[PDB]
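The freezer alarm interrupted the setup, so I double-checked each line after restarting. Inputs confirmed:
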Amino acid sequence: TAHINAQPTDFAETVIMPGDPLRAKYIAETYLTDAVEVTNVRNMLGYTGYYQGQRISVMGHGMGISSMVLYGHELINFFGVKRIIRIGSLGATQQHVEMRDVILAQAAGTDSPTNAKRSSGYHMATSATFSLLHKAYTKANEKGISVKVGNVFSGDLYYDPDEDMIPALERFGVLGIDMEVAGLYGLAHQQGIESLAILTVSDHCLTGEETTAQERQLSFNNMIELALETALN
Amino acid sequence: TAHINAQPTDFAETVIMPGDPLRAKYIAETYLTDAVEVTNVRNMLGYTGYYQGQRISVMGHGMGISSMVLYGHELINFFGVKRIIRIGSLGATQQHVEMRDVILAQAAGTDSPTNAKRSSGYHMATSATFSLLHKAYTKANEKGISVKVGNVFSGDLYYDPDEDMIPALERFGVLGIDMEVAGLYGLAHQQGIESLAILTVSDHCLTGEETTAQERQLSFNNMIELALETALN
Amino acid sequence: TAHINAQPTDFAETVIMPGDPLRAKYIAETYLTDAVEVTNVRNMLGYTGYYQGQRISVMGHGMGISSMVLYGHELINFFGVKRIIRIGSLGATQQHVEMRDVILAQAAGTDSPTNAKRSSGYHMATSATFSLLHKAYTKANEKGISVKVGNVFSGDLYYDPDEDMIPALERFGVLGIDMEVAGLYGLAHQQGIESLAILTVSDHCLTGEETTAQERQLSFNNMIELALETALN
Amino acid sequence: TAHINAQPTDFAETVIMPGDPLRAKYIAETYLTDAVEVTNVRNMLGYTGYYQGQRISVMGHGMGISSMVLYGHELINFFGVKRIIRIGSLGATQQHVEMRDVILAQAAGTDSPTNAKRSSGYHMATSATFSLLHKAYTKANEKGISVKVGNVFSGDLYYDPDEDMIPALERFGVLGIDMEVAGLYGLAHQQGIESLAILTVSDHCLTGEETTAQERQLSFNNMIELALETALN
Amino acid sequence: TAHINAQPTDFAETVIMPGDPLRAKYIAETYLTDAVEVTNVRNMLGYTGYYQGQRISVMGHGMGISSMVLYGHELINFFGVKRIIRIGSLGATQQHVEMRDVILAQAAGTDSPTNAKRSSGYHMATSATFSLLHKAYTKANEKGISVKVGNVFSGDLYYDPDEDMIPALERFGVLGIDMEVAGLYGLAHQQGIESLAILTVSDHCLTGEETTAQERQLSFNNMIELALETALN
Amino acid sequence: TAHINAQPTDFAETVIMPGDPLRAKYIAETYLTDAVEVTNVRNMLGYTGYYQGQRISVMGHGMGISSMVLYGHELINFFGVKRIIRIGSLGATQQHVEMRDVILAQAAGTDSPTNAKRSSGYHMATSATFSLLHKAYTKANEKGISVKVGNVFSGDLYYDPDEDMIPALERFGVLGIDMEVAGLYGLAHQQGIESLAILTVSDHCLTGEETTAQERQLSFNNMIELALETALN
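Predicted 3D structure, all chains:
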């Protein structure tokens, strides 16, 4: 396990995972009680703390499916982890998707062939654990947080050469594009754990619409609160 | 539209679709008020009637994705249809899935390359409309009906040469196997309509467990009630 | 065998198969002596009767390869069937193909990956049994029936998103497009039985040319006579 | 046209093509009247002569689809050629195929993706021109020559790493394996010319059975006579 | 350029890139004169300094092709970078490869389909810039450093489900396995820049042989010296 | 070994291989001492002689990967051959590549799926043996011969239907296109022997620029000298 330098018991059974380790740090200091840094190999920081009297971990997963699923695999297999909630952002690919929306990823597709390889060569579906999906939905509603539930696409190239990619996603109903969601779901199915991705909208790929920093921050907070409440049993 | 011999206005905006046209007939006579047979080209029977004072259609879609999506495409494009709920059965591929369970298909994968072709060559996710998925879930719970929500796989060959197929589905968490669900979802995304598949368990591919005809019938009734309540706005 | 409700001995060794079960019915009443309905599960009607003192069956196979090969597989494996002749129609994709022509499908290609899966992952040829192909050719000539022998393509999507599909078929010499021929041939090779598809022209995809109902009916009759004479040893 | 050093009019409209240029030479000296060597670039010899008072060419095509279709393309496009009959040998892959049989290749499959590329990305059928196929069949019968008509497979690697290849061909009904037939057929369809492959059995891949040189020679003669009679209008 | 928070001129034309940003830091403090941290977004640290009076940058690229090529793309396109040398480690897959060897990656293959997508759908070669490859080779020899030059494979799943993967690499001559080399080379070809990967052996996948920390450190130093001398014009 | 009619010991451990057997003949008469023709099956001529007192063979390999790798496989497996240097020509696909340049193929890509099949289904790199690549480079420099070292692409269709093929190669840095290089390299890796392709420029696919016969001949001589000096230990 050359990639995580925690002790075997150092993680909660749920790990919330942004891409950016500095985001995990921020969450650990801002939202968690008594967070302790448990891993920092390669600057990929992770923490274990408490939320509303319950144990919970938050850790960066870095960029791209390859990065995410490597960390994910180690958490599951060496650190006893049973649930991973990804918190990220996506580029919006529907007109009805708004800058302030939180996206709950019901299912994801990808151009990474790593999922098909996990599922014995077949193109099996890769989706969020429903109980978690349902819980986050319910909480978003109880909290008056604007959500959209639907499909995302995780692409391997942030700088993809296919100029028709975004229009292709729009034509098929896709809510937005990210890099990792599909990886997490594939990993979760293959590994037999639970997962969900909750995402804010970092850009609108159709409109290019801009936001104030305080609008950006309200999204973030909403996503974190939602991820924490969903995680905590 | 050589495949449906209805008039343009003859369908409700929702169509419930079993595979077997004789099942559609049975549903129209048993559950609907004032059902009228509106189509019978090629013995593929369809009906329009009322449930709890609301207009609703039920029609066979035949066997396999090719069959299902052809009818589906005509309904959407020539008959103004906005929602299709498939009611089917599947072969169970998890030990925790029971003979009496109703399966709500969150998402589906397939070996039909027809979905990838719809979604511009990309392997985009194919899933149920969440509002419908959530509604059926809620109703199943309100009604005390045993549900499981998760992934299905739709295979093109009922008699598939791959002996490892069923074990492959089990290893990846899949709830069961059918023939059409993935087709419906792909069609729905590409066509911009709503869809959901609700399924009973016709066989258990892991245990081979048997049922009385009255157990089989209780499943069926549950599925129909659920499909009707989900459909009706 | 949940899809055919005949007794094990209820079929002749040859089964003629249109897509439409109502077509099988019509053939059984119009051309066969003493036809008996032997199967009607799911409204998919099939018959066994006599032609010129010889036993022969005719049965619908429904729409799409998935449908056709499921029925085909059951006939071969549970009902002792040794020969299947498909009688269908196709959309013509050559200028020299005329509305009144009967097409004898020498070989077929497809976008269904079900054939490659049957043939161990290799893209092996899928063609008509030559003895049958030769016999139908000979009979068409003896009878003065206009035939064309060549290649067909069976596509999975009747409503295919590729606008260049028809021109693509034309550029490569293809006589016309249908939905099932390739499936039958693949099944036949894998199962070790004999097969042939005989087809009329339902539309001309290049010219859009129209026909009187009596022209349409003369094609049909020709195809049936040819299928019957080919079948009968 | 750096590969054929004939003059534009130097070929007959039909070219008979073995793989071995020394075989073409032998045929030109043994069977043709007044054969003239018309090309010898790269030792790939070709001839134009007369058979029964009709003009006819015979030329080596070398080994593998890449070789065959390069020459084929030049013949069609720069030398006005309208028909190519391949005369070859194959490794037999059916028990009922005998050392003395001449195989008429109705259709061919391949692992060369060059055919799919010709046919716009689709896996369209690649088969012999029926009129030619029928004529050779008829002549073989009139001459009392033992024929089998069916499917061949053309593989790119004479020394293929897949040990299950031969059994795979057997399981799917394939008559035997060669290197070029599929290439010729694909070329012919794409180029709009006529073609046919006639083949003797050089080895039996199932039985390993051996032959006297005079048995080998009787096959050859039969194939040549058949190819000549088929070609000559 | 949300991923690098340097100013446009902050990088040298060559960037040396380990996976681990803490490795870049260490190199900047240990080998560079006057290194300045120029980027730290997401804890992905990068530096610009001097080696033997010449300007040079060193930056982490994180784990997996997706990560590497995202950073790579930004460096090339927004920061004027003309050359990237990856310094990494690999799992050895040949018996003749030793724990103390430095590997110069002549060319790389991958299971990432991102390279094929860069090269217009074709599986074009992805290799090191020869001038750089030759220079590093020469320097290794002048310095008495043990090198091996050959092929690497970059796999997307550090935890790959294919148990035959390592034996497969061995059977084909491959020197070892990593995660990113192929990505860098594909990026370099598509972007028109220069690149090379120099790698130490972190594990021997065939022998599992162990090393002292001082043996591990001598490899590292050798690799760094080599990368620096190769980079500096 | 029906394709080479030499005795088992008739070849040197290195074989230089042009495509054209008449080129091998010419080389054997012009550059070798005491060359003896050792094989001529199918007009594919090969020779064994001496260069500067060392034993060396030269043999045609014909056109296309299928041809090349068949001969290559026989040489390696039945004739003890340990090294094959291909001498060919390519169509140039870079502006900086000149008519007088000799190309040293560092690595090659292909549309032949034969390489992937050799390397267990993975798209492993196929490249020249570095020691040979380095030696030829060194000699070219010592001799004042203009070289370029980089990537080639070997295509299966000399007459390829993709009009964007050449521009695609240019966009990705490729030096030029041939038919066989990739095959040789794949064979070499799978078989565990050494290989290298040295190539002259027969056409410039970007500029269409023309040459005198004496310019063409100077290239050739350079290539031969280089191949001989590289081969001879």
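Quick read of the result. Residues 213-231 of chain F form the longest helix (19 residues).
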